[PDB]
């Protein structure tokens, strides 16, 4: 048993459970927005997979929302950063007089933990595999994965 991911096409899967039918998605892959245009206007929501490329195999999922008049919204479950980072790019693909405002939400998961673990478990790795008469790379990732979801 193992899991991490962002999910993927199980994005369309969780949507269909909520009704709404099967939805047209969007993307930014290697910097190229695939999101267009009126299918969103009839749907009211994209959602978009960001941060993906030939290298990066997972992504960052966000949601395009259509508001009243010319208003469009961006929901990233963070919330200031990440979606002020997609603003200028994504807002270019909407019709001319459209405005894209980023929802002022507060991020979900609390990403600060990552930086802690880069310090905490990152030099603990240095404290382990480099150097000594060391365990394997699988063994170190297995320690760290257990250690990382332990404290929580």
The catalytic residues are: 60, 76, 114
Q: What's the CA gap between 10 and 6, in Å, rounded?
A: 9
Nearest-angstrom CA–CA distance, 72 and 36:
13
Contact 96, 72 (CB under 8 A): no
Query: Cα Rg for the chain, rounded, in angstroms?
Result: 19
Q: Do residues 63 and 75 make contact, with C-beta atoms less than 8 angstroms apart?
A: yes
How far is 8 from 56, CA to CA, in rounded Å? 13
Do residues 52 and 31 make contact, with C-beta atoms less than 8 angstroms apart? no
């Amino acid at each position: 048993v193992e899991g991490v991911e962002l999910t993927q096409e199980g994005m369309h899967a969780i949507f269909a459970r909520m009704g709404y039918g099967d939805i047209t998605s969007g993307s930014i892959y290697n910097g190229v927005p695939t999101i267009d245009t009126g299918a969103l206007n009839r749907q009211g929501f994209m959602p978009v997979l960001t941060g993906v490329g030939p290298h990066r195999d997972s992504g960052h999922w966000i949601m395009l929302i259509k508001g009243p008049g010319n208003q469009y919204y961006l929901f990233d479950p963070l919330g200031k950063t990440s979606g002020e980072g997609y603003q200028n790019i994504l807002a270019a693909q909407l019709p001319m007089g459209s405005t894209l405002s980023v929802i002022p939400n507060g991020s979900g998961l609390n990403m600060g933990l990552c930086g802690y673990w880069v310090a905490s478990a990152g030099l603990r790795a240095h404290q382990a595999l480099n150097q000594h008469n060391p365990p394997t790379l699988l063994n170190v990732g297995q320690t760290i994965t257990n250690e990382m979801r332990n404290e929580l």
